[PDB]
Design a protein around this ligand. Structure first.
Ligand SMILES: O=C(O)CCC(=O)Nc1ccc(Br)cn1
Length: 562
C-alpha cells in the first residue's frame, strides 16, 4: 500500500471560533443581497476532505518520463543558487505567520530577537546533523469563502505546515532555488514569471503560432495527494543538479527525507492525527515541487500521446496545453492517451479534459483570455475570470477584517476587467473614503506571496502591470458582459448601472481629497464620466520597486515581500 495518508482518528481541530455564515453589517446589502449563498469552510467538514484525499497511489514510469527528467536535470545543472543568511530569511517571514511552538513568534523573527535567531541556528544545525527523523507538522482546516454551487458546499482544504523555526531554515536552504530554478528548467512554460498581461500575451502568441490550434486544460484530482515519494525524491534530485553550497546540499537532502517526503500530522490540540506520504501544502517547495512534477508528467504524457508542436503553461498543479490540431477526431483520441499516460504517472483527472478550438473558452488558473477595445478602438486581449468567488470574498471582507484582503489582490490582478473596475474599485474605495483609510497599507497575496500595499498606490501599480489601457478599456465582449451580469443576479448584487451611478460619486469624493486620492479618482474612475479626462503616464509609477512581483509562485510558502 502506498496510501497518501493514514489516520489515527483524532480530529482536525480549530485554533479559534470559526464562522461559516456570511457576517452582515450595514454595508453588506449595498454589495450583495443573497447572503445564504456565501459561506466559509471550517474544520466541521475536514472529515469529508480526509476521505477525498486518502487513496492508494500507483506509478508506472516509462522511457518518456525518464527522457524528460534527464532533459530537466540538464537545464537545472546550469543554475547557481545561494544560501540566504538568517537575517535575509527572517525578513521574508510574514509579520502574522504562525508562532513557533518554541517560545517566539513571527515578530521576534522579523526583529532578529536573540531567542528566535538562536533557535533557528539550532534547527539548522539539527538539519545538517540528522537526515532521518521525521519533522513534526500541524494539520489545519483552511477557512475559505465560496459561493454555494447547486450543481452545494466544498469541504475545507487542509494545510500541513512545519514549525516557524523550520520554515526559516527552508528559506535559507531553498528560497533562491525555488525562485530561480523553475524558469531555467521550464523556460516560457513557467507560469509564475508572467504578470496577467504577460500571461495573456504568451497564450495569444502561442495560439497564433499553431496552423490549426487546439488547447486544453488538465485538471488533476487532488494533485497534492497524487504526489508520491518517488515524485518528491525526483524533485530533490533536480534541486541537487544546481551549483549549491555543500551546507545547502545537506539541508535540502535533510528537508527532503524528514519533511518533504512525509511525516506525522499533529492537530492544534497537540494530538497525533496520522501520517502523510504525499505533498505537504504548507512548505516552501509546494509551488516549485508541484510545478516541476506537473511539467515532468505532462511533458512525458505529451510524448506518449504524440501531440504535435505542444506548448505547455504550468503554474503548480494548474496545466494548460496548446498544440497543433490533428483534426477533431484525432484530437479527442490524443487527449484520452494523454490522460491515460498522466494516470499511469499517478496524476488522474478530476473532470476529463476536452479539446478547445476557441482560446477564450480555455480556463486556466481559474482565468481566461477575453477581448475589449482601447481608447483608439484597437482590439486588446486581457485576463478575466468568473467573478463569483471574488464577489463572495468581497462580501465577507465588507463585514470582517481578514489576514488577506482578496479584493485588493483581485483589483491588482484583474484591474482591466469590467467587474473589478465597476464593482470592486467602486465598493472598496467608497468604504475606505468613509473610514478615512486610503493611506493604510493592507496585506494581500499575489502568486501565494504576501504584500503590504497602500490602496492609494493602485493607479501606479496598475499602470506598471497593465499599462494605461487598463484605465481606458471599453466594448467588452457580449460573453464577458453576460457572465458578469449573470453572476450579479445569482448573488443579488446590484446591476452594473447602479455601480456606474455609485462610481461617479466615489470619483467626485476622491477628487475632493486632492493628492494621491484625486489621482485614484482621476485614473481608476475615468470610465464613470461622460467628459473623460486625458490619462497620461504617472511619474510615481516608474519609482515603484516591483521586483519580485511576478518571478515565482510561493503558495503555502510563508513568503512576505514588504
Ligand atoms: O463601448 C462603449 O464605450 C460603451 C460601453 C462600454 O464599454 N462602457 C464601459 C466601459 C468601461 C467600463 Br469599466 C464600463 N462600461
Amino acid at each position: 500500500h502506498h496510501m497518501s495518508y493514514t489516520w489515527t482518528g483524532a480530529l482536525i481541530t480549530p485554533c479559534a471560533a470559526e464562522e461559516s455564515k456570511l457576517p452582515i453589517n450595514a454595508l453588506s446589502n449595498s454589495l450583495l443581497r443573497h447572503h445564504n449563498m456565501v459561506y466559509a469552510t471550517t474544520s466541521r467538514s475536514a472529515g469529508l476532505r480526509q476521505k477525498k484525499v486518502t487513496f492508494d497511489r500507483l506509478q508506472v514510469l516509462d522511457d518518456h518520463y525518464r527522457d524528460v527528467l534527464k532533459e530537466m536535470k540538464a537545464k537545472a545543472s546550469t543554475v547557481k543558487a545561494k544560501l540566504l543568511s538568517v537575517e535575509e530569511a527572517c525578513k521574508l517571514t510574514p509579520p502574522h505567520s504562525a508562532k513557533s511552538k518554541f517560545g517566539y513568534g513571527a515578530k521576534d523573527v522579523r526583529n532578529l530577537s536573540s531567542k528566535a535567531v538562536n533557535h533557528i541556528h539550532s534547527v539548522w544545525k539539527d538539519l545538517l546533523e540528522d537526515t532521518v527523523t521525521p519533522i513534526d507538522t500541524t494539520i489545519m482546516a483552511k477557512n475559505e469563502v465560496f459561493c454555494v454551487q447547486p450543481e452545494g458546499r466544498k469541504p475545507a482544504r487542509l494545510i500541513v505546515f512545519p514549525d516557524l523555526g523550520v520554515r526559516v531554515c527552508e528559506k535559507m536552504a531553498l528560497y533562491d532555488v525555488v525562485s530561480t530554478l523553475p524558469q531555467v528548467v521550464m523556460g516560457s512554460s513557467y507560469g509564475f514569471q508572467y504578470s496577467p498581461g504577460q500571461r495573456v500575451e504568451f497564450l495569444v502568441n502561442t495560439w497564433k503560432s499553431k496552423k490549426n490550434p487546439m488547447g486544453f486544460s488538465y485538471d488533476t484530482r487532488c494533485f497534492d495527494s497524487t504526489v508520491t515519494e518517488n515524485d518528491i525524491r525526483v524533485e530533490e534530485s533536480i534541486y541537487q543538479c544546481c551549483d549549491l553550497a555543500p551546507e545547502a546540499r545537506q539541508a535540502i537532502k535533510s528537508l527532503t527525507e524528514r519533511l518533504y517526503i512525509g511525516g506525522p500530522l499533529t492537530n492544534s490540540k497537540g494530538q497525533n492525527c496520522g501520517y502523510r506520504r504525499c505533498r505537504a501544502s504548507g512548505v516552501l517547495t509546494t509551488s516549485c515541487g508541484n510545478t516541476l512534477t506537473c511539467y515532468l508528467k505532462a511533458s512525458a504524457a505529451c510524448r506518449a500521446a504524440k501531440l504535435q508542436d505542444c506548448t505547455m503553461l504550468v503554474n503548480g498543479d494548474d496545466l494548460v496545453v496548446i498544440c497543433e490540431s490533428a483534426g477533431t477526431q484525432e484530437d479527442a483520441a490524443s487527449l484520452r492517451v494523454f490522460t491515460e499516460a498522466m494516470t499511469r504517472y499517478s496524476a488522474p483527472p478530476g473532470d476529463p479534459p476536452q479539446p478547445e478550438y476557441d482560446l477564450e473558452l480555455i480556463t486556466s488558473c481559474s482565468s481566461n483570455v477575453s477581448v475589449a477595445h482601447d481608447a483608439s478602438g484597437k482590439r486588446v486581449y486581457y485576463l478575466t475570470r468568473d467573478p463569483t468567488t471574488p464577489l463572495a470574498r468581497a462580501a465577507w471582507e465588507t463585514a470582517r477584517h481578514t489576514p488577506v484582503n482578496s479584493w485588493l489582490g483581485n483589483i491588482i490582478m484583474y484591474a482591466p476587467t469590467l467587474w473589478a473596475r465597476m464593482i470592486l474599485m467602486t465598493h472598496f474605495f467608497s468604504i475606505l473614503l468613509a473610514q478615512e483609510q486610503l493611506e493604510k497599507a493592507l496585506d494581500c497575496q499575489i502568486y501565494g506571496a504576501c504584500y503590504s500595499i497602500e490602496p492609494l498606490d493602485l493607479p501606479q501599480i496598475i499602470e506598471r502591470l497593465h499599462g494605461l489601457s487598463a484605465f481606458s478599456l471599453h466594448s467588452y465582449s457580449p460573453g464577458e458582459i453576460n457572465r458578469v451580469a449573470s453572476c450579479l443576479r445569482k448573488l443579488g448584487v446590484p446591476p452594473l448601472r447602479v455601480w456606474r451611478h455609485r462610481a461617479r460619486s466615489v470619483r467626485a469624493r476622491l477628487l475632493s481629497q486632492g493628492g494621491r486620492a484625486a489621482t485614484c479618482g482621476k485614473y481608476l474612475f475615468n470610465w464613470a464620466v461622460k467628459t473623460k479626462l486625458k490619462l497620461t503616464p504617472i511619474p510615481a509609477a516608474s519609482r515603484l520597486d516591483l521586483s519580485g512581483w511576478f518571478v515565482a509562485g510561493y503558495s503555502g510558502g510563508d513568503i512576505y515581500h514588504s
